């Protein structure tokens, strides 16, 4: 139940959903982060 962007940032793409980007690893995944679950 993590609130507020911690390490990850999500943007909603014209595909109609949000993708999660981790600012340390520079990784973009559609899977919900552990530190943002």
Curated annotation (Swiss-Prot):
Entry comment describing in which tissues the protein is expressed: Detected in brain neurons.
UniProt-annotated location(s): Nucleus
Inducers of expression: Up-regulated in brain tissue from patients with Huntington disease.
Ranges where the WW domain occurs: 2-35
Origin: domain of life: Eukaryota
Oligomeric and partner information: Binds formin. Interacts (via the second WW domain) with TREX1 (via proline-rich region). Binds RNA polymerase II, HD and SF1.
Entry's free-text remark on domains: The FF domains bind the phosphorylated C-terminus of the largest subunit of RNA polymerase II, probably mediate interaction with HTATSF1 and preferentially bind peptides with the consensus sequence [DE](2-5)-[FWY]-[DE](2-5). The WW domains bind Pro-rich domains.
Function: Transcription factor that binds RNA polymerase II and inhibits the elongation of transcripts from target promoters. Regulates transcription elongation in a TATA box-dependent manner. Necessary for TAT-dependent activation of the human immunodeficiency virus type 1 (HIV-1) promoter.
Protein name listed in UniProt: Transcription elongation regulator 1
Source organism: Homo sapiens
